[PDB]
Design an enzyme around this catalytic site. Structure first.
Site, PDB file in Angstrom:
ATOM      1  N   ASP A   1       0.778  -1.328   0.447  1.00  0.00           N
ATOM      2  CA  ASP A   1       0.053  -0.023   0.271  1.00  0.00           C
ATOM      3  C   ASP A   1       1.262   1.251   0.474  1.00  0.00           C
ATOM      4  O   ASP A   1       1.608   1.806   0.469  1.00  0.00           O
ATOM      5  CB  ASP A   1      -0.821   0.534   1.449  1.00  0.00           C
ATOM      6  CG  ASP A   1      -2.121   0.931   0.996  1.00  0.00           C
ATOM      7  OD1 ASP A   1      -2.680   1.065   0.290  1.00  0.00           O
ATOM      8  OD2 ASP A   1      -1.700   2.185   1.376  1.00  0.00           O
TER       9      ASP A   1
ATOM     10  N   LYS B   1      -2.270   6.540  -4.710  1.00  0.00           N
ATOM     11  CA  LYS B   1      -3.935   6.618  -4.336  1.00  0.00           C
ATOM     12  C   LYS B   1      -3.492   8.561  -4.909  1.00  0.00           C
ATOM     13  O   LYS B   1      -2.624   8.475  -4.740  1.00  0.00           O
ATOM     14  CB  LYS B   1      -4.168   7.252  -2.553  1.00  0.00           C
ATOM     15  CG  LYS B   1      -3.617   5.178  -2.193  1.00  0.00           C
ATOM     16  CD  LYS B   1      -4.280   5.995   0.047  1.00  0.00           C
ATOM     17  CE  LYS B   1      -4.180   4.727   0.477  1.00  0.00           C
ATOM     18  NZ  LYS B   1      -2.356   3.780   0.287  1.00  0.00           N
TER      19      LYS B   1
ATOM     20  N   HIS C   1      -7.864   9.645  -2.238  1.00  0.00           N
ATOM     21  CA  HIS C   1      -6.870   8.896  -1.245  1.00  0.00           C
ATOM     22  C   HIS C   1      -7.648   9.312   0.131  1.00  0.00           C
ATOM     23  O   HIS C   1      -8.090   9.302   0.480  1.00  0.00           O
ATOM     24  CB  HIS C   1      -5.728   9.440  -0.703  1.00  0.00           C
ATOM     25  CG  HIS C   1      -4.824   9.567  -0.274  1.00  0.00           C
ATOM     26  ND1 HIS C   1      -3.407   9.522  -0.050  1.00  0.00           N
ATOM     27  CD2 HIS C   1      -5.460   8.697   1.302  1.00  0.00           C
ATOM     28  CE1 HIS C   1      -2.871   9.149   0.607  1.00  0.00           C
ATOM     29  NE2 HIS C   1      -4.005   8.581   1.728  1.00  0.00           N
TER      30      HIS C   1
ATOM     31  N   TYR D   1       3.139  10.253   0.324  1.00  0.00           N
ATOM     32  CA  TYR D   1       4.378   9.958   1.283  1.00  0.00           C
ATOM     33  C   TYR D   1       5.368  10.528   1.286  1.00  0.00           C
ATOM     34  O   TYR D   1       6.279  10.175   2.208  1.00  0.00           O
ATOM     35  CB  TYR D   1       3.829   7.919   1.382  1.00  0.00           C
ATOM     36  CG  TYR D   1       2.088   7.678   2.027  1.00  0.00           C
ATOM     37  CD1 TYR D   1       1.678   8.286   2.659  1.00  0.00           C
ATOM     38  CD2 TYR D   1       1.634   6.483   2.204  1.00  0.00           C
ATOM     39  CE1 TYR D   1       0.019   7.722   3.084  1.00  0.00           C
ATOM     40  CE2 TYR D   1       0.825   5.549   2.350  1.00  0.00           C
ATOM     41  CZ  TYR D   1       0.148   6.733   3.065  1.00  0.00           C
ATOM     42  OH  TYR D   1      -1.524   6.672   3.391  1.00  0.00           O
TER      43      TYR D   1
HETATM   44  N1  LIG Z   1      -6.172   5.887   2.817  1.00  0.00           N
HETATM   45  C1  LIG Z   1      -5.269   6.693   4.295  1.00  0.00           C
HETATM   46  O1  LIG Z   1      -5.846   7.648   4.422  1.00  0.00           O
HETATM   47  C2  LIG Z   1      -4.330   5.882   4.877  1.00  0.00           C
HETATM   48  C3  LIG Z   1      -4.184   6.375   6.498  1.00  0.00           C
HETATM   49  C4  LIG Z   1      -3.383   5.877   7.495  1.00  0.00           C
HETATM   50  C5  LIG Z   1      -2.720   4.633   7.035  1.00  0.00           C
HETATM   51  N2  LIG Z   1      -2.934   4.480   5.576  1.00  0.00           N
HETATM   52  C6  LIG Z   1      -2.216   3.246   4.870  1.00  0.00           C
HETATM   53  O2  LIG Z   1      -2.043   1.609   6.537  1.00  0.00           O
HETATM   54  C7  LIG Z   1      -1.034   1.839   6.475  1.00  0.00           C
HETATM   55  C8  LIG Z   1      -1.080   0.979   7.879  1.00  0.00           C
HETATM   56  O3  LIG Z   1      -1.346   2.153   8.708  1.00  0.00           O
HETATM   57  P1  LIG Z   1      -0.352   3.265   9.721  1.00  0.00           P
HETATM   58  O4  LIG Z   1       0.458   3.002   9.225  1.00  0.00           O
HETATM   59  O5  LIG Z   1      -0.720   4.605  10.103  1.00  0.00           O
HETATM   60  O6  LIG Z   1      -0.300   2.584  11.417  1.00  0.00           O
HETATM   61  P2  LIG Z   1      -0.027   0.442  11.829  1.00  0.00           P
HETATM   62  O7  LIG Z   1      -0.448  -0.092  10.705  1.00  0.00           O
HETATM   63  O8  LIG Z   1      -1.673   0.769  12.310  1.00  0.00           O
HETATM   64  O9  LIG Z   1       0.766   0.694  12.874  1.00  0.00           O
HETATM   65  C9  LIG Z   1       2.305   1.074  12.204  1.00  0.00           C
HETATM   66  C10 LIG Z   1       3.468   1.041  13.717  1.00  0.00           C
HETATM   67  O10 LIG Z   1       2.925  -0.625  14.654  1.00  0.00           O
HETATM   68  C11 LIG Z   1       4.158  -0.580  14.778  1.00  0.00           C
HETATM   69  N3  LIG Z   1       4.136  -2.090  14.589  1.00  0.00           N
HETATM   70  C12 LIG Z   1       4.094  -2.852  13.462  1.00  0.00           C
HETATM   71  N4  LIG Z   1       4.075  -4.476  13.972  1.00  0.00           N
HETATM   72  C13 LIG Z   1       4.321  -4.438  15.154  1.00  0.00           C
HETATM   73  C14 LIG Z   1       4.584  -5.600  15.532  1.00  0.00           C
HETATM   74  N5  LIG Z   1       4.171  -6.833  15.362  1.00  0.00           N
HETATM   75  N6  LIG Z   1       4.305  -5.052  17.956  1.00  0.00           N
HETATM   76  C15 LIG Z   1       4.792  -4.097  17.608  1.00  0.00           C
HETATM   77  N7  LIG Z   1       4.130  -2.678  16.976  1.00  0.00           N
HETATM   78  C16 LIG Z   1       4.331  -2.987  15.090  1.00  0.00           C
HETATM   79  C17 LIG Z   1       5.030   0.400  12.993  1.00  0.00           C
HETATM   80  O11 LIG Z   1       6.262   0.300  14.214  1.00  0.00           O
HETATM   81  P3  LIG Z   1       7.768  -0.132  13.227  1.00  0.00           P
HETATM   82  O12 LIG Z   1       7.109   0.325  11.955  1.00  0.00           O
HETATM   83  O13 LIG Z   1       8.736   0.261  13.675  1.00  0.00           O
HETATM   84  O14 LIG Z   1       8.323  -1.439  13.404  1.00  0.00           O
HETATM   85  C18 LIG Z   1       4.513   1.411  12.962  1.00  0.00           C
HETATM   86  O15 LIG Z   1       4.604   2.163  14.161  1.00  0.00           O
HETATM   87  C19 LIG Z   1      -0.016   2.947   6.444  1.00  0.00           C
HETATM   88  O16 LIG Z   1       1.048   2.686   6.316  1.00  0.00           O
HETATM   89  C20 LIG Z   1      -0.564   3.235   4.597  1.00  0.00           C
HETATM   90  O17 LIG Z   1      -0.156   2.913   4.036  1.00  0.00           O
HETATM   91  C21 LIG Z   1      -3.500   4.903   4.921  1.00  0.00           C
HETATM   92  O1  LIG Z   2      -3.082  10.429   4.684  1.00  0.00           O
HETATM   93  C1  LIG Z   2      -2.877   9.552   4.967  1.00  0.00           C
HETATM   94  O2  LIG Z   2      -3.019   8.470   4.051  1.00  0.00           O
HETATM   95  C2  LIG Z   2      -2.538   9.509   6.587  1.00  0.00           C
HETATM   96  O3  LIG Z   2      -2.192  10.770   6.664  1.00  0.00           O
HETATM   97  C3  LIG Z   2      -1.452  11.846   6.261  1.00  0.00           C
HETATM   98  C4  LIG Z   2       0.217  11.181   5.176  1.00  0.00           C
HETATM   99  C5  LIG Z   2       0.488  12.536   5.139  1.00  0.00           C
HETATM  100  F1  LIG Z   2       1.079  11.550   4.417  1.00  0.00           F
HETATM  101  C6  LIG Z   2       0.355  13.099   4.907  1.00  0.00           C
HETATM  102  C7  LIG Z   2      -0.658  13.929   5.567  1.00  0.00           C
HETATM  103  C8  LIG Z   2      -1.595  12.477   6.253  1.00  0.00           C
HETATM  104  C9  LIG Z   2      -3.102  13.349   7.234  1.00  0.00           C
HETATM  105  O4  LIG Z   2      -2.676  14.904   7.195  1.00  0.00           O
HETATM  106  N1  LIG Z   2      -3.958  12.854   6.618  1.00  0.00           N
HETATM  107  C10 LIG Z   2      -5.538  12.509   6.917  1.00  0.00           C
HETATM  108  C11 LIG Z   2      -6.074  13.941   5.849  1.00  0.00           C
HETATM  109  C12 LIG Z   2      -5.875  13.907   4.659  1.00  0.00           C
HETATM  110  C13 LIG Z   2      -6.335  14.849   3.801  1.00  0.00           C
HETATM  111  C14 LIG Z   2      -7.766  15.660   4.267  1.00  0.00           C
HETATM  112  C15 LIG Z   2      -7.974  15.261   5.085  1.00  0.00           C
HETATM  113  C16 LIG Z   2      -9.337  14.981   5.933  1.00  0.00           C
HETATM  114  O5  LIG Z   2      -9.859  15.813   7.045  1.00  0.00           O
HETATM  115  O6  LIG Z   2     -10.463  15.768   4.883  1.00  0.00           O
HETATM  116  C17 LIG Z   2      -7.332  14.441   5.898  1.00  0.00           C
END
Ligand SMILES: NC(=O)c1ccc[n+]([C@@H]2O[C@H](COP(=O)([O-])OP(=O)(O)OC[C@H]3O[C@@H](n4cnc5c(N)ncnc54)[C@H](OP(=O)(O)O)[C@@H]3O)[C@@H](O)[C@H]2O)c1
Ligand SMILES: O=C(O)COc1cc(F)ccc1C(=O)NCc1cccc(C(=O)O)c1
Ligand SMILES: O=C(O)COc1cc(F)ccc1C(=O)NCc1cccc(C(=O)O)c1
Length: 316
Positions: free
Chosen positions: A44, A78, A111, A49
């Site tokens: 993803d 995205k 996104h 990012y």
């Molecule tokens: N569409 C959107 O708007 C949106 C928004 C947010 C996220 N996303 C996607 O979803 C992905 C995942 O969400 P996220 O990055 O917010 O957080 P997450 O996956 O919920 O948590 C990541 C954190 O958990 C830690 N971690 C991972 N595996 C672990 C384990 N086995 N034990 C302990 N800690 C562990 C990682 O540490 P380390 O990396 O230091 O190991 C990091 O600090 C994102 O990276 C992105 O690709 C999309």
């Molecule tokens: O968005 C993700 O995937 C993870 O969060 C981020 C990652 C970045 F690299 C930079 C900013 C963000 C962030 O602030 N997101 C939240 C977001 C973004 C756009 C609109 C709204 C809204 O509330 O409309 C909310």
């Protein structure tokens, strides 16, 4: 548990992928290489990012090494908010393809439903800190996404952070050509999303759960905030199954028929997090985890709370 879920475009999507938000550019190439070596077949990504070039180095090197064939990978990116204009969507997709060193994406998502003024800044602000909106509506952005399918740049299109009324708007779009394949939303035991998940699943849209571990590395985390990985109740379920808390948190959405995308740059955790296909949570475990919902949402932007398309005023 089968490893892939069938999408409404006829393609199969791996239910476990690697997240890359916050993965530092000097660490993410090795993270993705390790992930592919230990079995991940879904990554993803997003332009916002700022690490797609480095993700791409890893993908291209594993393809060159013949560790995996391109058809076996499922690469997601995205469209950022400053590219919702008709005339900018293709170039935004092309920049992501160039950086990832791919000739197509398996899935490309809007996104966020909130479009912003185009320009160099990812969050263009007025002098009081409100984001500057675009006037391009989600339906016109969707039509631009449909073109990308018809041009061969992407195999599937979808949405992210859309509330049920925004999903419905697309499903009701006059002349809709391709339904969204996926809605990617925040989902974990403290934000269980039952209503939105049931709506999407009832329409044949696959839901991907982001921040499944509660995003403990999110930049705005506070020391006192809730912690899924440290919740003793979740630790107890993990101990009963001889698994880690993270493994329970990953298996949970899988058993709800969701895709899940935990992020790590730690090689041991990348491997650990994939070892979730050999145990089951009971129905009682699942209902117990669902009971922890507190509507605790970690991912939103205060600068966007007056945007007409801000998704989180609605209940779901
Ligand atoms: N569409 C959107 O708007 C949106 C928004 C947010 C996220 N996303 C996607 O979803 C992905 C995942 O969400 P996220 O990055 O917010 O957080 P997450 O996956 O919920 O948590 C990541 C954190 O958990 C830690 N971690 C991972 N595996 C672990 C384990 N086995 N034990 C302990 N800690 C562990 C990682 O540490 P380390 O990396 O230091 O190991 C990091 O600090 C994102 O990276 C992105 O690709 C999309
Ligand atoms: O968005 C993700 O995937 C993870 O969060 C981020 C990652 C970045 F690299 C930079 C900013 C963000 C962030 O602030 N997101 C939240 C977001 C973004 C756009 C609109 C709204 C809204 O509330 O409309 C909310
Ligand atoms: O509002 C944003 O841009 C990013 O989210 C935050 C930022 C904070 F400084 C403090 C809390 C949040 C928050 O609760 N988000 C959801």
């Amino acid at each position: 548990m089968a490893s892939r879920i069938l999408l409404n475009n006829g393609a199969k999507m791996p239910i476990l992928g690697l997240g890359t938000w916050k993965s530092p550019p000097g660490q993410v190439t090795e993270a993705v290489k390790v992930a592919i070596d230990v079995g991940y077949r879904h990554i993803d990504c997003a332009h916002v990012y700022q690490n797609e070039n480095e993700v791409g180095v890893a993908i291209q090197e594993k393809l060159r090494e013949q560790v995996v064939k391109r058809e076996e990978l499922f690469i997601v990116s995205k469209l950022w908010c400053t590219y919702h204009e008709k005339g900018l969507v293709k170039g935004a997709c092309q920049k992501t393809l160039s950086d990832l060193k791919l000739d197509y994406l398996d899935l490309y998502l809007i996104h966020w439903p909130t479009g912003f003024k185009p320009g160099k800044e990812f969050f263009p602000l007025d002098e009081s800190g409100n984001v500057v909106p675009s006037d391009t509506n989600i339906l016109d952005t969707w039509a631009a996404m449909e073109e990308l399918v018809d041009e061969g740049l992407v195999k599937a299109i979808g949405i992210s952070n859309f509330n049920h009324l925004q999903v419905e708007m697309i499903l009701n779009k006059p002349g809709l050509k391709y339904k969204p394949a996926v809605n990617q939303i925040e989902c974990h035991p403290y934000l269980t999303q039952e209503k939105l998940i049931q709506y999407c699943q009832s329409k044949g849209i696959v839901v991907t759960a982001y921040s499944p571990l509660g995003s403990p590395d999110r930049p705005w985390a506070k020391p006192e905030d809730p912690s899924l990985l440290e919740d003793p109740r979740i630790k107890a379920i993990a101990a009963k199954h001889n698994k880690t808390t993270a493994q329970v948190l990953i298996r949970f959405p899988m058993q709800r028929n969701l895709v899940v995308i935990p992020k790590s740059v730690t090689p041991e955790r990348i491997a650990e997090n994939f070892k979730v296909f050999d145990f089951e949570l009971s129905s009682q475990d699942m209902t117990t985890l669902l009971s922890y919902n507190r509507n605790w949402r970690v991912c939103a932007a205060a600068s966007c709370t007056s945007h007409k398309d801000y998704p989180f005023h609605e209940e779901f």
